[PDB]
Amino acid sequence: EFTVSTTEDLQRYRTECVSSLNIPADYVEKFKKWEFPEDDTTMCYIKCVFNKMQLFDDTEGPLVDNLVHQLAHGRDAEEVRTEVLKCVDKNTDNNACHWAFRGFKCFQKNNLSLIKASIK
């Protein structure tokens, strides 16, 4: 089974991803206020955290059932699934960091509240 991620899963994954990727504190500050510059440093951050939460695979791409579970807590599956899938695309520029980001970007645009609430 896949289980949901919380604030202190995120906290852990944030510090691990900052470490391995060597993310400037600069960038970390923006992430904490849900701001995301459109460059590789931010893109690979998102991939890393998604990898650790089991929401994205570098080969397979977005993991749809897990994304819906994460967001829905297995409650409002069908509605959330429809919104999640609108943001699912293929690895068009063979850049896994970009792929994960572009998904996250699509979904944060309209549904950022749900993302924050999925952690809470």
> Using the rule CB under 6 A, is 14 a contact of ligand DCR?
yes
Q: Taking CA 21 as the corner, what is the angle to CA 73 and CA 7, rounded to the nearest 5 degrees?
A: 25
Q: Does 104 bind ligand DCR (CB under 6 A)?
A: yes
Q: With binding defined as CB under 6 A, does residue 42 bind ligand DCR?
A: no
Task: Give the residue nearest to ligand DCR (CB).
Answer: 107
Work out the number of other CB atoms within 10 angstroms of the CB of residue 82: 10
According to DSSP, residue 38 is labeled S
* Lookup result for tokens 């509240």: 113
Residue 119 near ligand DCR by CB under 6 A: yes
Does 81 carry a binding-site annotation? Answer: no
By CB under 6 A, which span of 18-26, 45-53, 73-81, 89-97 interacts with ligand DCR? 45-53
103 lines the binding site for ligand DCR (CB under 6 A): yes
82 residue type, one letter: T
By the criterion CB under 6 A, which residues form the site for ligand DCR?
A: 5, 10, 14, 31-32, 46, 49, 53, 55, 67, 70-71, 84, 87, 103-104, 107, 115, 118-119
